[PDB]
Design a protein around this ligand. Structure first.
Ligand code: FE
Ligand code: FE
Lengths: 123, 122, 123, 122
């Protein structure tokens, strides 16, 4: 939901995701990672299902961060894919792909995979 | 690589990715999938490294499609995470995650993973 | 970690992983899934690092289940890749890939990804 | 597909996968990687669907390598999950997860994902 997703989210690492959901299905915001080659806030953009099912299924969504801002450039990008689950203990359950720019000889080693769970309460 | 990425791309399935790269690192555009629960064009947004390394490595990028447009809603979203490699054989090499909305009981089964390679012809 | 890995483990879904670690780095056992329409026990085999680092690093391992037994055949296989953490909170943190047999036209839709955490306590 | 799968396979990196498929669903063999922290052959074990569908679907399978042999220990393991596709041009299409032993604080960064296609030729 628009005002379900909009706001501040924390994952299990202590990273902070501040997002605004548009009526169209846009997500826009900033991300601050607690870990990795990262400092301060990075722009994010994504999309969500702006007319989800009302059968107790989650709301599908995804977003991207390119790890370039006015401090640092890690030459990498992370995408989170997952769903917003509402009601009590609201959460966004995600899996993510982090791709680093590599030479083609090393492209086999370009991409990390993991899982982040975001909650409304600070961990 | 604003000029390198901006344009039409095709993956191995015949899906069509039309993207504009902004100087600020933004990606915006439309995606049309050759497969799945998909009809016509869907909005995409993403981000790329607008100041890449100068050493021959690729340009990292990612984008999202939520599979809702004016025709159809599949209650799902896909993210592609990858890199742009330039030249005459320019390609975008990606891996993707497609999450469908599920109940919490079925959340273990929410997410498909695959790989798409996009090129400028075909 | 031969003694550490050997045992009965449960994940967050209530699945049961019974495994014996061999000195050679072998894992052998049975898996019972609580979800995904599996029935009874399936054979598993895998490998672990039989000489891990001593710095507090986890022990890397992986195993495979093909979802065929005497009762049922899902025409699929799951692999788990992860690490065993020792000491007080002994856990195996994994990500997994579940591939189903598909036609070539449908191969894009062959593979689910997820994450399982296994502990010796049943949830 | 016992004899379909049994034998020598090569991926796009020049790695070599030598495998024996048992009647009982077992896979056993050796793996030699062309890349990464790897020298000589490593033991693999896995499983495959020993009674696949007859509808033109591939045969599901998976295997594991822990990257420790007589020569080296990388403190990591890779699992490949995929399917064997027979007929005219035989291939094993896989995705893989490579997990390195890490501390708990660094476990976010433990796992690489990729895709390997193995063919009969080369
Ligand atoms: Fe690395
Ligand atoms: Fe499905």
């Amino acid at each position: 939901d628009e005002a379900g997703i909009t706001g501040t989210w924390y994952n299990q690492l202590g990273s902070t995701f501040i997002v605004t959901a548009g009526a169209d299905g846009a997500l826009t915001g900033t991300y601050e990672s607690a870990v990795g080659n990262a400092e301060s806030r990075y722009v994010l953009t994504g999309r969500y299902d702006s007319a989800p099912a009302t059968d107790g299924s989650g709301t599908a969504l995804g977003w991207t961060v390119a790890w370039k801002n006015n401090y640092r450039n890690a030459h990498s990008a992370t995408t989170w894919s997952g769903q917003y689950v509402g009601g009590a203990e609201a959460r966004i359950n995600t899996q993510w792909l982090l791709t680093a720019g590599t030479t083609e000889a090393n492209a086999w080693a370009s991409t990390l995979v993991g899982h982040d769970t975001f909650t409304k309460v600070k961990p």
